[PDB]
Structures are given as structure tokens and as C-alpha cells.
């Protein structure tokens, strides 16, 4: 028995051990109470505005579109405190945890960005924060690990299984099943058991709300399409949510194609996966033929979630949103193009969304179209990764 529908069509649900269900129900109830509470909204809005930097700018990109009939805007989540959209929702979840009377935060992270976001939110609000991280990911992300420790977070390396996100996530859930009386589990994307897909969307929907008001002010019309990259799906659903009922607005999610879909090394479960049950939810996922969960691959570690949020699977199935893929090489080129012609260094994650926009513009250069790309993060974190690849190509 839940207050909210845990399913989006057939996708979603609460597929967790029985022991965890009191924790999810207590969370759903606190969320519903908080959503109706003007005091909660005013505190949340105050942190977003005076600490994180909202509202973010909507930047027109004339240089990139010259000689076409495409007008392109970037929603500048790279200007948010912390350098990525993740900040919006960790601040909401951290306030929610305080409202529930919790004093500890549990999180898991792969590339480290959700680790950093969880740690800065816990430092600000006086929460004790422990972060589980795969030992293979710990080695590869010493910058982000140091950041987390500077901010007072305990980083618990996990020496189990494949030492990747999966062991940590599973260790984080196990931790939470014992500690949920005092601790809140801060899930990092719009996936997982209900009510997390719903909560993470609602704490990201200001992205699309600001974008609607800002585009109406600057162009007097809604865009023809909004384009966002899709890992687990939080920045995309944050951009999409306020446009869902505006059926003339295309919604385009971009998954990583890796080296190519045909090669097998990619991260597009929504379009090349199979419905399964994992991580508390029923959703398209990448799995072997006898049902083991596969790792997704992408030059952008931030898009390596082996599934996708259930609301995206639902939007695809009814035809409200379209999901495409973009390869590593297409993403790097869009990265270089933005640096050179606008002076913005984008995250390699966000470069997938930009690359698809550049493709829509370049394939049909006389098509008149107003596009918005959600620039979900800045790419200072990717400077070394891009450099090594550009050197290995004699560039």
C-alpha cells in the first residue's frame, strides 16, 4: 500500500527485500508531506538560489549554427555549484532527510560526481556522510575521492565482487537495511525502487521549468525539441517533465553508443536492452541471455548505468519521447566544437546531447528549428581523458 503509483505503465515497482519496505514507505510519506509544505519549498528554493546558483543561464549559440536555420540554446547546468545538475537533487534529499530526523547520509558513486555532490550537501547541512565506491573506481578517480574527503565524507572502499558500482550499491543498500532509522540513502539518479524515480524527478524539474520561462521570454515560442543525455535519467527527466503536456515539443534522450551498438560495447539499454528486474525496479537493462547484468561502456563514465529510469521506458513505449544513441567519437567532436566556437568546456556526458543536436542541424541545414540542449555539466573533469585520446591520435 503506497500513497503514489509506483509504476509508469509496466515499468518501475519496489523490488527490494521485505526488510527494506518500511524504509521506502516512510520515505514516500515524508516526501508527500514535504511537497505540500510551503516551508519546505521555501527552504529548498533558498538553498538553490543563494547557495547553488539558480536560476542557470540559457545561452544562445550563434557561432555554432551559422549558415543553417537551426537556433540552438544551452541550458547551463555547468554553471551550477559543483559543476553539474546533480547538486539540485542532493540538496532536496538532504533537506528531506533532516525533515525525517535522520543524521547520516549513505551514498554510492562510480565516476565520483554523485559522491562529491552528496558530500557537499552533507557538509552544508551538518549531516554525517558515508560513500561506498568500487575499489577499481577509487583508483581511477583520486581527484574526486580527495574532494570527498576534504568535505568530511567517509569513503568506504569495497573489496568485493567486481569492485565496481554494483558492489558498492549493493553494499549501500545492505548498510541502509540496518541503519534506516538514523540514515537516509541518497540514490544518485532517477531509477531504483519507488519512490526514488519520482523524488529525483521532482527535485530536478526546475531545470525544465526555468527553461520554459526563459525560452518564452527570449523567443516567444516553445522549442521544437529539447535534447538531454540519458545515463540513469535524472537530468533528462528534469528537463522533460514540464514539457510533457506540451505535445508539440519533441523530447529527445541521448544514450551512449560507445564504440558502436554493433560492437556490443555501449551503454544504450533503453534501445538495445531487455526488460528485467534489478536495483529494485522493472526496466530495460543490459543483460546476458540467461539474465546476468552486464556492464555498460562509454568514454563518459557518467553515462555507465546498466539500466534506465522507468519513466523514460514508459515515455518511449507510448511514443511521447524518442531515444537515440551517440558514439564516443561523435561526442568528442562535439566537445571540441563547443570549446572552439563558444568558449564552454562541456562534460563528455553532455557532449552526447550536443552531438545529436549538431547532427540534426547538419543533416538538414535548411530546416528551421529551435533546439534546446541541456548542458548537464562542465568538462574540467574530462580534460585529461580528452587530452590522452587526442594525443593517441596525433592531434
Amino acid at each position: 500500500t503506497t500513497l503514489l503509483n509506483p509504476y509508469f505503465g509496466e515499468f518501475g515497482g519496489m523490488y527490494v527485500p521485505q526488510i527494506l519496505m518500511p524504509a521506502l514507505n516512510q520515505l514516500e510519506e515524508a516526501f508527500v508531506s514535504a511537497q505540500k509544505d510551503p516551508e519546505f519549498q521555501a527552504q529548498f528554493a533558498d538553498l538553490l538560489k543563494n547557495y547553488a546558483g539558480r536560476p542557470t543561464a540559457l545561452t544562445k549559440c550563434q557561432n555554432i549554427t551559422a549558415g543553417t536555420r537551426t537556433t540552438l540554446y544551452l541550458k547551463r547546468e555547468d554553471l551550477l555549484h559543483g559543476g553539474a545538475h546533480k547538486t539540485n537533487q542532493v540538496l532536496g534529499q538532504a533537506l528531506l532527510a533532516k525533515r525525517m530526523g535522520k543524521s547520516e547520509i549513505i551514498a554510492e558513486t562510480g565516476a565520483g560526481q554523485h559522491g562529491v555532490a552528496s558530500a557537499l550537501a552533507s557538509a552544508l547541512l551538518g549531516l554525517k556522510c558515508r560513500i561506498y565506491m568500487g575499489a577499481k573506481d577509487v583508483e581511477r578517480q583520486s581527484p574526486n575521492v580527495f574532494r570527498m574527503r576534504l568535505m568530511g565524507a567517509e569513503v568506504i572502499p569495497v573489496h568485493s565482487g567486481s569492485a565496481t558500482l554494483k558492489d558498492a550499491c549493493n553494499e549501500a543498500l545492505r548498510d541502509w537495511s540496518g541503519s534506516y532509522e538514523t540514515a537516509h540513502y541518497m540514490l544518485g539518479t532517477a531509477a531504483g525502487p519507488h519512490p526514488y524515480p519520482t523524488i529525483v524527478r521532482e527535485f530536478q524539474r526546475m531545470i525544465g521549468e526555468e527553461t520554459k520561462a526563459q525560452i518564452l521570454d527570449k523567443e516567444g515560442r516553445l522549442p521544437d525539441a529539447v535534447i538531454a543525455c540519458v545515463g540513469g535519467g535524472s537530468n533528462a527527466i528534469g528537463m522533460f517533465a514540464d514539457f510533457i503536456n506540451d505535445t508539440s515539443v519533441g523530447l529527445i534522450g541521448v544514450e551512449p553508443g560507445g564504440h558502436g551498438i554493433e560492437t556490443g560495447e555501449h551503454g544504450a539499454p533503453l534501445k538495445h536492452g531487455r526488460v528485467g528486474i534489478y536495483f529494485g525496479m522493472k526496466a530495460p537493462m543490459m543483460q546476458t541471455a540467461d539474465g546476468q547484468i552486464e556492464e555498460s561502456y562509454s568514454i563518459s563514465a557518467g553515462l555507465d548505468f546498466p539500466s534506465v529510469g522507468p519513466q523514460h521506458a514508459y515515455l518511449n513505449s507510448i511514443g511521447r519521447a524518442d531515444y537515440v544513441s551517440i558514439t564516443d567519437d561523435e561526442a568528442l567532436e562535439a566537445f571540441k566544437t563547443l570549446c572552439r566556437h563558444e568558449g564552454i568546456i562541456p562534460a563528455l556526458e553532455s557532449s552526447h546531447a550536443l552531438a545529436h543536436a549538431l547532427k540534426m542541424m547538419r543533416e538538414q541545414p535548411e530546416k528551421e528549428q529551435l533546439l534546446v540542449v541541456n548542458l548537464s555539466g562542465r568538462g574540467d573533469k574530462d580534460i585529461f581523458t580528452v587530452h590522452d585520446i587526442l594525443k593517441a591520435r596525433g592531434e
Partner: protein, 255 residues
Amino acid sequence: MERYENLFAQLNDRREGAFVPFVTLGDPGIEQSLKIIDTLIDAGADALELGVPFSDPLADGPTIQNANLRAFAAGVTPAQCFEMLALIREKHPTIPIGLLMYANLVFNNGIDAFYARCEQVGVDSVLVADVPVEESAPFRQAALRHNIAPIFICPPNADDDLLRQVASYGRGYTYLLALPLHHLIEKLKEYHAAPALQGFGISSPEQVSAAVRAGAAGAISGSAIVKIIEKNLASPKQMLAELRSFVSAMKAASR
């Protein structure tokens, strides 16, 4: 479940609790696993609980996590597990066999086809670790259509409304994992639940006798068996001898 009904009637006629070991199928290799299981049965296990190796065991501690890794290392697949199960049943026609599964392995090729395959090889019960009662309808309905008992875990943080659903939805036995045990056992008896087996950290002969005396129909040793495997990996002959001594001590403790 019919095997379970027979099992518990005989055990009641002897004023005796059930002792149920858990092991992962194929750990540490297919041939050694089959030897382990035969050893546990000869030493007096009343029933078996068997795990199928899964990539993301979200409800399992580190001891079982490593057990799954060894089985994967040895090339064990779901299909191989089912061949192992047909062989175990052919050799031991009366012992109840319960599977501990994760939902995706059940769902992968069709929920109904998974329970049909359990019925064919002679499995008696299935516990899906990451399906709570609130989501269990398509699983327990497929279980009942193929004469498989659906097992549910009754957690420590359980409340009265969960107790009635577990008592009403489960068959075979109730997996017991706050509220004073004794109460839990009498409430479940009040609601006519399947017999309760205590499964939380049963690792010494004394806990086995404490559970049976507290009202439980027996005890499940969730990881103590897997530890003995992990201790004696380098000497299969010593592994078996330690398993036979531990199990026969636990079984003695239930009379």
C-alpha cells in the same frame, strides 16, 4: 510443499525440529558441490535450501557474495543448476528442496516457465529474495499453478499487517529473519502460517535447540555451511569431514 508437509508431520511425531543448511549450487565446482550436498544429506539435513548464482546479489552478505563468485568462476549457469537439481532429486526422492532466487533469474524467460521448470525437476519451494509480498502476485500465482510453495521472509521489523499477508500467501514454511520471537511465533500460529523456521544467524548447536524450544519448527543455517567451504578450499577431503561433523552436531541439537 507436499514433501514439506510430510517432513513436518514425521518430525512432530519424533518431537524434533528441522535443520536446513544453505549452499550455493556449483560452489566451488559442479562435482564438488554435488559431493557437498550428498554429504549434508547423509549427515542428517532434513531439507535443503539452494542458491542459484546471480551477478548482483542485492540481499546477500559477503560470505554468500564470494560463494557466487566461485560458482561463476567455475562456469556455473542457471541451466547447469537445473541439471544439478534433477540429479539431486533422482538420488534423494523424499528430501524437500527449496531454491533461493533473485527476481531477474525468475523473470528472464517467463515467470510461468520458470516455475514449470522447477516442477519438472522436482523442486518443492522457491523464495525470491527481492520480491516483497506487495509485489508477489504474479510469482506466487505461477508457483501455485505448478505446485511450488512460495516462501516469504518474515522480517524483524515486521508488523501485524505483514504477518497476516505472509501467513496467507506463503506455503511450505515461513522464513523467520521489533517483536519478541515468541510472540511472532504465536501470531503466525494464530494466522495459520506455514511452520516457521528460524534463519537469522544459526551457527551453533545451542541456537538450534533455542529456536525449537521457542516454538520454531526448525532452523536454517544461512551461511555457517558456506564458511566451512571457504575455510577448506585447498583440501576437499577435509571440507567434507568438517561439514559432516558440523551438520551432525546441529541435527543432534534439534531432538
